[PDB]
Amino acid sequence: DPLFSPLDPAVLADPYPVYRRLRETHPVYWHAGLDSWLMTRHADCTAILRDPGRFSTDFRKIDIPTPPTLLSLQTLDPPDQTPLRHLALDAVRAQDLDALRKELTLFADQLLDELADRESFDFIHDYADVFTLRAITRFIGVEPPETDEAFARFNDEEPGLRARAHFNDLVRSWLGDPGPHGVLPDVVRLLPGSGVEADDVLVNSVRAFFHAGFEVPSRFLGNALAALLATPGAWEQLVRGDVGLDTAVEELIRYVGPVQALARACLQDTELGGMAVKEGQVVTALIGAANRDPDQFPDPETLRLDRKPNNHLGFGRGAHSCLGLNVARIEAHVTLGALLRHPGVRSAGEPVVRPNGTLRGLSRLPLTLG
Protein backbone atom coordinates (compact mmCIF):
# COMPACT_ATOMS: atom_id res chain seq x y z
CA ASP A 1 0.00 0.00 0.00
CA PRO A 2 1.38 3.41 -1.01
CA LEU A 3 -0.11 5.24 2.00
CA PHE A 4 0.02 2.79 4.91
CA SER A 5 1.82 -0.54 5.32
CA PRO A 6 1.44 -1.44 9.03
CA LEU A 7 4.24 -4.03 8.94
CA ASP A 8 6.77 -2.10 6.84
CA PRO A 9 9.95 -2.02 9.01
CA ALA A 10 10.23 1.76 8.56
CA VAL A 11 6.63 2.14 9.74
CA LEU A 12 7.04 -0.08 12.80
CA ALA A 13 10.07 1.97 13.87
CA ASP A 14 7.94 5.13 14.04
CA PRO A 15 4.34 4.73 12.79
CA TYR A 16 3.04 8.07 14.09
CA PRO A 17 4.41 10.35 11.33
CA VAL A 18 2.78 7.89 8.87
CA TYR A 19 -0.43 7.96 10.92
CA ARG A 20 -0.35 11.77 10.89
CA ARG A 21 0.15 12.10 7.15
CA LEU A 22 -2.53 9.51 6.39
CA ARG A 23 -4.90 11.44 8.68
CA GLU A 24 -4.12 14.71 6.89
CA THR A 25 -5.04 13.33 3.45
CA HIS A 26 -7.39 10.34 3.96
CA PRO A 27 -8.77 10.35 7.52
CA VAL A 28 -11.21 7.63 6.36
CA TYR A 29 -9.15 5.39 4.09
CA TRP A 30 -10.04 2.13 2.41
CA HIS A 31 -7.07 -0.25 2.71
CA ALA A 32 -7.39 -3.00 0.11
CA GLY A 33 -4.66 -5.11 1.73
CA LEU A 34 -6.35 -5.20 5.17
CA ASP A 35 -9.74 -5.28 3.40
CA SER A 36 -11.01 -2.67 5.84
CA TRP A 37 -11.66 1.03 6.27
CA LEU A 38 -9.06 2.86 8.35
CA MET A 39 -10.31 5.67 10.62
CA THR A 40 -7.50 7.82 12.07
CA ARG A 41 -9.58 10.63 13.64
CA HIS A 42 -10.73 10.79 17.25
CA ALA A 43 -14.33 11.72 16.40
CA ASP A 44 -14.74 8.86 13.91
CA CYS A 45 -13.16 6.26 16.20
CA THR A 46 -15.34 7.44 19.08
CA ALA A 47 -18.48 7.11 16.95
CA ILE A 48 -17.39 3.65 15.78
CA LEU A 49 -17.03 2.38 19.36
CA ARG A 50 -20.27 3.89 20.75
CA ASP A 51 -22.79 2.30 18.33
CA PRO A 52 -22.91 -1.49 18.74
CA GLY A 53 -26.02 -1.82 16.56
CA ARG A 54 -24.05 -0.14 13.76
CA PHE A 55 -20.47 -1.39 14.35
CA SER A 56 -20.42 -4.79 16.04
CA THR A 57 -17.76 -6.99 17.62
CA ASP A 58 -19.75 -10.10 16.58
CA PHE A 59 -18.49 -10.76 13.06
CA ARG A 60 -21.08 -13.54 12.76
CA LYS A 61 -23.57 -10.79 11.90
CA ILE A 62 -21.74 -10.37 8.58
CA ASP A 63 -21.67 -14.18 8.28
CA ILE A 64 -18.08 -14.85 9.36
CA PRO A 65 -18.14 -17.87 11.77
CA THR A 66 -16.63 -17.53 15.23
CA PRO A 67 -14.28 -20.31 16.40
CA PRO A 68 -15.99 -22.06 19.33
CA THR A 69 -13.09 -21.35 21.70
CA LEU A 70 -13.16 -17.60 20.95
CA LEU A 71 -16.86 -16.85 21.54
CA SER A 72 -16.57 -14.71 24.65
CA LEU A 73 -17.32 -11.36 26.28
CA GLN A 74 -15.02 -9.73 23.71
CA THR A 75 -16.69 -11.20 20.60
CA LEU A 76 -20.30 -10.75 21.75
CA ASP A 77 -22.43 -7.62 21.56
CA PRO A 78 -25.43 -6.56 23.65
CA PRO A 79 -27.73 -8.08 24.69
CA ASP A 80 -25.79 -11.36 24.32
CA GLN A 81 -22.69 -9.83 26.05
CA THR A 82 -24.64 -7.93 28.77
CA PRO A 83 -24.79 -10.64 31.52
CA LEU A 84 -21.08 -11.50 31.08
CA ARG A 85 -20.07 -7.85 30.94
CA HIS A 86 -21.86 -7.11 34.23
CA LEU A 87 -20.59 -10.29 35.89
CA ALA A 88 -17.02 -9.35 35.00
CA LEU A 89 -17.67 -5.74 36.10
CA ASP A 90 -19.09 -6.92 39.43
CA ALA A 91 -16.15 -9.26 40.05
CA VAL A 92 -13.55 -6.60 39.23
CA ARG A 93 -15.12 -3.89 41.37
CA ALA A 94 -15.18 -6.22 44.40
CA GLN A 95 -11.36 -6.34 44.38
CA ASP A 96 -9.27 -4.35 46.88
CA LEU A 97 -7.18 -2.01 44.73
CA ASP A 98 -5.36 -0.45 47.70
CA ALA A 99 -4.11 -3.90 48.72
CA LEU A 100 -2.97 -4.59 45.16
CA ARG A 101 -1.07 -1.28 44.94
CA LYS A 102 0.72 -2.08 48.20
CA GLU A 103 1.87 -5.54 47.14
CA LEU A 104 2.82 -4.42 43.62
CA THR A 105 4.93 -1.64 45.15
CA LEU A 106 6.78 -4.36 47.07
CA PHE A 107 7.23 -6.52 43.97
CA ALA A 108 8.44 -3.66 41.77
CA ASP A 109 11.05 -2.60 44.36
CA GLN A 110 12.25 -6.24 44.72
CA LEU A 111 12.59 -6.67 40.94
CA LEU A 112 14.42 -3.41 40.29
CA ASP A 113 16.65 -3.77 43.36
CA GLU A 114 17.86 -7.08 41.93
CA LEU A 115 18.26 -5.67 38.40
CA ALA A 116 20.12 -2.66 39.81
CA ASP A 117 23.19 -4.91 40.03
CA ARG A 118 23.30 -5.49 36.26
CA GLU A 119 25.19 -3.21 33.90
CA SER A 120 22.48 -3.70 31.26
CA PHE A 121 19.23 -5.65 31.22
CA ASP A 122 16.13 -6.03 29.07
CA PHE A 123 13.27 -4.12 30.70
CA ILE A 124 10.73 -6.17 28.72
CA HIS A 125 11.91 -9.64 29.74
CA ASP A 126 13.17 -8.82 33.24
CA TYR A 127 10.52 -6.35 34.45
CA ALA A 128 7.49 -5.67 32.22
CA ASP A 129 6.66 -9.33 31.63
CA VAL A 130 7.53 -10.43 35.18
CA PHE A 131 5.74 -7.49 36.84
CA THR A 132 2.54 -7.75 34.80
CA LEU A 133 2.34 -11.55 35.06
CA ARG A 134 2.52 -11.29 38.85
CA ALA A 135 -0.12 -8.55 38.81
CA ILE A 136 -2.70 -10.42 36.65
CA THR A 137 -2.20 -13.75 38.53
CA ARG A 138 -2.67 -12.05 41.92
CA PHE A 139 -5.61 -9.98 40.60
CA ILE A 140 -7.40 -13.00 39.17
CA GLY A 141 -6.42 -15.10 42.19
CA VAL A 142 -4.71 -18.04 40.48
CA GLU A 143 -1.24 -19.51 40.66
CA PRO A 144 1.03 -20.11 37.65
CA PRO A 145 1.23 -23.82 36.76
CA GLU A 146 4.59 -25.21 37.83
CA THR A 147 5.09 -26.78 34.39
CA ASP A 148 4.50 -23.41 32.63
CA GLU A 149 5.10 -20.72 35.24
CA ALA A 150 5.24 -17.99 32.56
CA PHE A 151 2.10 -19.16 30.69
CA ALA A 152 4.41 -19.39 27.67
CA ARG A 153 2.27 -21.94 25.84
CA PHE A 154 -0.58 -19.41 25.72
CA ASN A 155 1.35 -16.34 24.53
CA ASP A 156 0.72 -17.30 20.88
CA GLU A 157 -3.89 -24.27 13.77
CA GLU A 158 -3.88 -27.36 15.98
CA PRO A 159 -1.11 -26.15 18.37
CA GLY A 160 -3.14 -22.97 18.77
CA LEU A 161 -6.35 -24.91 19.41
CA ARG A 162 -4.42 -27.19 21.77
CA ALA A 163 -3.06 -24.25 23.76
CA ARG A 164 -6.52 -22.74 24.17
CA ALA A 165 -7.99 -26.13 25.12
CA HIS A 166 -5.24 -26.59 27.72
CA PHE A 167 -5.89 -23.10 29.11
CA ASN A 168 -9.62 -23.81 29.26
CA ASP A 169 -8.89 -26.96 31.28
CA LEU A 170 -6.93 -24.86 33.78
CA VAL A 171 -9.82 -22.38 34.00
CA ARG A 172 -12.37 -25.10 34.75
CA SER A 173 -10.11 -26.46 37.49
CA TRP A 174 -9.82 -22.94 38.94
CA LEU A 175 -13.59 -22.47 38.80
CA GLY A 176 -14.11 -25.84 40.50
CA ASP A 177 -11.66 -25.12 43.35
CA PRO A 178 -11.42 -21.34 43.67
CA GLY A 179 -8.74 -19.72 45.80
CA PRO A 180 -9.34 -17.48 48.80
CA HIS A 181 -9.39 -14.22 46.85
CA GLY A 182 -9.43 -12.60 43.43
CA VAL A 183 -11.64 -11.92 40.44
CA LEU A 184 -12.12 -15.62 39.58
CA PRO A 185 -13.27 -16.67 43.12
CA ASP A 186 -15.71 -13.68 43.05
CA VAL A 187 -16.98 -14.74 39.63
CA VAL A 188 -17.74 -18.15 41.14
CA ARG A 189 -19.60 -16.60 44.07
CA LEU A 190 -21.47 -14.14 41.84
CA LEU A 191 -22.27 -16.61 39.06
CA PRO A 192 -25.52 -17.93 40.63
CA GLY A 193 -28.18 -15.38 39.73
CA SER A 194 -25.94 -13.57 37.24
CA GLY A 195 -27.84 -14.66 34.14
CA VAL A 196 -24.56 -16.22 32.96
CA GLU A 197 -24.22 -19.98 32.43
CA ALA A 198 -20.95 -21.63 33.57
CA ASP A 199 -20.36 -22.72 29.96
CA ASP A 200 -17.69 -22.42 27.27
CA VAL A 201 -18.38 -18.70 26.77
CA LEU A 202 -17.61 -18.02 30.43
CA VAL A 203 -14.43 -20.12 30.30
CA ASN A 204 -13.38 -18.42 27.07
CA SER A 205 -14.06 -15.04 28.69
CA VAL A 206 -11.79 -15.85 31.63
CA ARG A 207 -9.06 -16.72 29.14
CA ALA A 208 -9.62 -13.44 27.28
CA PHE A 209 -9.64 -11.57 30.59
CA PHE A 210 -6.21 -13.01 31.42
CA HIS A 211 -4.76 -12.00 28.05
CA ALA A 212 -6.32 -8.54 28.24
CA GLY A 213 -4.56 -8.14 31.60
CA PHE A 214 -1.17 -9.59 30.59
CA GLU A 215 0.12 -8.78 27.09
CA VAL A 216 -1.55 -5.33 26.83
CA PRO A 217 -0.18 -3.86 30.13
CA SER A 218 3.28 -5.47 29.53
CA ARG A 219 3.46 -3.75 26.13
CA PHE A 220 2.33 -0.43 27.62
CA LEU A 221 4.98 -0.40 30.36
CA GLY A 222 7.70 -0.95 27.77
CA ASN A 223 6.25 1.65 25.41
CA ALA A 224 5.94 4.21 28.20
CA LEU A 225 9.52 3.91 29.43
CA ALA A 226 10.87 3.91 25.86
CA ALA A 227 8.98 7.15 25.16
CA LEU A 228 10.19 8.72 28.41
CA LEU A 229 13.80 7.88 27.54
CA ALA A 230 13.52 8.88 23.86
CA THR A 231 11.91 12.27 24.59
CA PRO A 232 14.60 14.78 25.65
CA GLY A 233 13.95 16.03 29.18
CA ALA A 234 10.90 13.82 29.78
CA TRP A 235 12.58 11.66 32.43
CA GLU A 236 14.27 14.64 34.09
CA GLN A 237 10.86 16.31 34.37
CA LEU A 238 9.67 13.32 36.39
CA VAL A 239 12.84 13.18 38.50
CA ARG A 240 12.51 16.91 39.27
CA GLY A 241 8.88 16.61 40.39
CA ASP A 242 7.75 19.07 37.70
CA VAL A 243 4.74 16.90 36.79
CA GLY A 244 2.45 14.55 38.70
CA LEU A 245 2.43 10.84 37.96
CA ASP A 246 -1.35 10.70 37.52
CA THR A 247 -1.38 13.12 34.58
CA ALA A 248 1.88 11.69 33.23
CA VAL A 249 0.44 8.17 33.09
CA GLU A 250 -2.61 9.40 31.16
CA GLU A 251 -0.38 11.30 28.72
CA LEU A 252 1.77 8.21 28.21
CA ILE A 253 -1.36 6.18 27.42
CA ARG A 254 -2.41 8.75 24.82
CA TYR A 255 1.10 9.08 23.40
CA VAL A 256 2.16 5.43 23.14
CA GLY A 257 -0.74 3.28 24.30
CA PRO A 258 -0.24 -0.22 22.89
CA VAL A 259 -3.65 -0.76 21.26
CA GLN A 260 -3.34 0.50 17.68
CA ALA A 261 -6.46 -0.91 16.02
CA LEU A 262 -9.97 -1.97 17.05
CA ALA A 263 -11.94 -3.70 14.30
CA ARG A 264 -15.73 -3.59 13.95
CA ALA A 265 -18.22 -5.03 11.47
CA CYS A 266 -20.45 -2.46 9.77
CA LEU A 267 -24.13 -3.50 10.10
CA GLN A 268 -25.71 -0.37 8.56
CA ASP A 269 -24.58 1.84 5.63
CA THR A 270 -22.78 4.85 7.18
CA GLU A 271 -21.00 7.91 5.80
CA LEU A 272 -17.74 8.76 7.61
CA GLY A 273 -15.24 11.37 6.49
CA GLY A 274 -17.21 11.60 3.27
CA MET A 275 -16.77 7.87 2.62
CA ALA A 276 -19.65 5.46 2.00
CA VAL A 277 -19.06 2.60 4.43
CA LYS A 278 -21.37 -0.28 3.51
CA GLU A 279 -23.01 -3.02 5.54
CA GLY A 280 -20.83 -6.12 5.54
CA GLN A 281 -17.59 -4.11 5.42
CA VAL A 282 -15.01 -4.03 8.20
CA VAL A 283 -13.95 -0.75 9.80
CA THR A 284 -10.79 -0.38 11.88
CA ALA A 285 -10.58 2.36 14.51
CA LEU A 286 -6.87 3.25 14.61
CA ILE A 287 -7.09 4.55 18.16
CA GLY A 288 -3.31 4.82 18.28
CA ALA A 289 -3.64 7.41 15.53
CA ALA A 290 -6.83 8.97 16.92
CA ASN A 291 -4.98 9.67 20.18
CA ARG A 292 -2.66 11.97 18.19
CA ASP A 293 -5.48 13.70 16.29
CA PRO A 294 -4.83 17.47 16.22
CA ASP A 295 -8.60 18.08 16.19
CA GLN A 296 -8.73 16.63 19.73
CA PHE A 297 -5.26 17.26 21.21
CA PRO A 298 -3.19 20.43 20.72
CA ASP A 299 0.44 19.73 19.85
CA PRO A 300 -0.52 16.04 19.48
CA GLU A 301 2.89 14.74 18.34
CA THR A 302 4.54 16.25 21.44
CA LEU A 303 4.76 14.43 24.78
CA ARG A 304 3.27 16.84 27.35
CA LEU A 305 3.30 15.04 30.70
CA ASP A 306 1.07 17.76 32.23
CA ARG A 307 -1.56 17.64 29.46
CA LYS A 308 -5.06 18.63 30.59
CA PRO A 309 -7.69 17.93 29.37
CA ASN A 310 -6.82 14.50 27.90
CA ASN A 311 -9.83 12.62 26.49
CA HIS A 312 -7.73 9.82 25.05
CA LEU A 313 -9.16 6.56 23.69
CA GLY A 314 -6.44 4.30 25.08
CA PHE A 315 -8.95 2.36 27.20
CA GLY A 316 -11.63 2.15 24.51
CA ARG A 317 -15.19 3.41 24.72
CA GLY A 318 -18.71 2.09 25.03
CA ALA A 319 -19.89 -1.47 25.51
CA HIS A 320 -16.41 -3.06 25.27
CA SER A 321 -14.43 -0.41 27.15
CA CYS A 322 -11.53 -1.67 29.25
CA LEU A 323 -12.51 -3.25 32.60
CA GLY A 324 -8.97 -3.30 34.01
CA LEU A 325 -8.12 0.36 33.43
CA ASN A 326 -7.75 1.11 37.14
CA VAL A 327 -5.45 -1.88 37.53
CA ALA A 328 -3.46 -0.70 34.49
CA ARG A 329 -3.08 2.77 36.01
CA ILE A 330 -1.91 1.34 39.34
CA GLU A 331 0.65 -0.79 37.48
CA ALA A 332 2.03 2.19 35.55
CA HIS A 333 1.97 4.47 38.59
CA VAL A 334 3.81 1.89 40.70
CA THR A 335 6.40 1.20 38.00
CA LEU A 336 7.26 4.87 37.48
CA GLY A 337 7.51 5.58 41.20
CA ALA A 338 9.76 2.54 41.63
CA LEU A 339 12.00 3.56 38.72
CA LEU A 340 12.18 7.11 40.10
CA ARG A 341 13.65 5.61 43.29
CA HIS A 342 16.79 4.86 41.22
CA PRO A 343 19.10 7.76 40.32
CA GLY A 344 20.49 6.67 36.96
CA VAL A 345 17.70 5.31 34.75
CA ARG A 346 19.01 5.48 31.19
CA SER A 347 18.91 3.49 27.97
CA ALA A 348 21.71 1.01 27.32
CA GLY A 349 21.10 0.06 23.70
CA GLU A 350 18.62 0.40 20.90
CA PRO A 351 15.03 -0.74 21.45
CA VAL A 352 13.66 -3.54 19.28
CA VAL A 353 10.05 -3.25 18.12
CA ARG A 354 7.78 -6.27 17.78
CA PRO A 355 6.51 -6.87 14.21
CA ASN A 356 2.92 -6.17 15.24
CA GLY A 357 0.71 -3.45 13.78
CA THR A 358 -2.31 -4.20 16.01
CA LEU A 359 -0.83 -4.33 19.54
CA ARG A 360 2.35 -2.24 19.49
CA GLY A 361 5.14 -3.27 21.84
CA LEU A 362 8.88 -3.77 22.21
CA SER A 363 10.68 -7.09 22.26
CA ARG A 364 13.82 -5.60 23.84
CA LEU A 365 14.40 -2.41 25.85
CA PRO A 366 18.04 -2.37 27.00
CA LEU A 367 18.24 -0.34 30.18
CA THR A 368 20.38 0.36 33.23
CA LEU A 369 19.37 1.87 36.57
CA GLY A 370 22.81 3.16 37.57
Ligand code: HEM
Ligand atom coordinates in the same frame (compact mmCIF):
# COMPACT_ATOMS: atom_id res chain seq x y z
C1 HEM B 1 -2.24 -0.29 29.80
C2 HEM B 1 -3.03 -1.34 29.99
C3 HEM B 1 -4.30 -1.55 29.27
C4 HEM B 1 -4.78 -0.97 28.13
C5 HEM B 1 -4.13 0.08 27.27
C6 HEM B 1 -6.04 -1.55 27.87
C7 HEM B 1 -6.81 -1.17 26.76
C8 HEM B 1 -8.01 -1.77 26.45
C9 HEM B 1 -8.84 -1.41 25.37
C10 HEM B 1 -8.58 -0.33 24.36
C11 HEM B 1 -9.92 -2.23 25.39
C12 HEM B 1 -11.08 -2.20 24.42
C13 HEM B 1 -11.05 -3.37 23.45
C14 HEM B 1 -12.17 -3.28 22.44
O1 HEM B 1 -12.94 -2.30 22.40
O2 HEM B 1 -12.34 -4.20 21.63
C15 HEM B 1 -9.76 -3.09 26.49
C16 HEM B 1 -10.68 -4.05 26.81
C17 HEM B 1 -10.52 -4.82 27.94
N1 HEM B 1 -9.57 -4.74 28.88
FE1 HEM B 1 -8.10 -3.57 28.88
N2 HEM B 1 -6.34 -2.44 28.81
C18 HEM B 1 -5.34 -2.50 29.69
C19 HEM B 1 -5.20 -3.28 30.84
C20 HEM B 1 -6.14 -4.22 31.22
C21 HEM B 1 -6.02 -5.07 32.32
C22 HEM B 1 -4.86 -5.10 33.28
C23 HEM B 1 -7.16 -5.86 32.34
C24 HEM B 1 -7.50 -6.91 33.31
C25 HEM B 1 -7.40 -6.71 34.61
C26 HEM B 1 -7.96 -5.47 31.24
C27 HEM B 1 -9.16 -6.02 30.94
C28 HEM B 1 -9.85 -5.69 29.78
C29 HEM B 1 -11.07 -6.40 29.41
C30 HEM B 1 -11.71 -7.53 30.18
C31 HEM B 1 -11.50 -5.85 28.27
C32 HEM B 1 -12.71 -6.25 27.45
C33 HEM B 1 -14.02 -5.57 27.82
C34 HEM B 1 -15.12 -6.10 26.93
O3 HEM B 1 -14.85 -6.61 25.83
O4 HEM B 1 -16.31 -6.04 27.28
N3 HEM B 1 -7.31 -4.47 30.59
N4 HEM B 1 -8.59 -2.79 27.13
Ligand SMILES: [Cl-]
Ligand atom coordinates in the same frame (compact mmCIF):
# COMPACT_ATOMS: atom_id res chain seq x y z
CL1 LIG C 1 6.47 -2.90 50.92
Ligand SMILES: [Cl-]
Ligand atom coordinates in the same frame (compact mmCIF):
# COMPACT_ATOMS: atom_id res chain seq x y z
CL1 LIG D 1 -24.82 8.19 6.80
Ligand SMILES: [Mg+2]
Ligand atom coordinates in the same frame (compact mmCIF):
# COMPACT_ATOMS: atom_id res chain seq x y z
MG1 LIG E 1 7.42 11.64 16.84
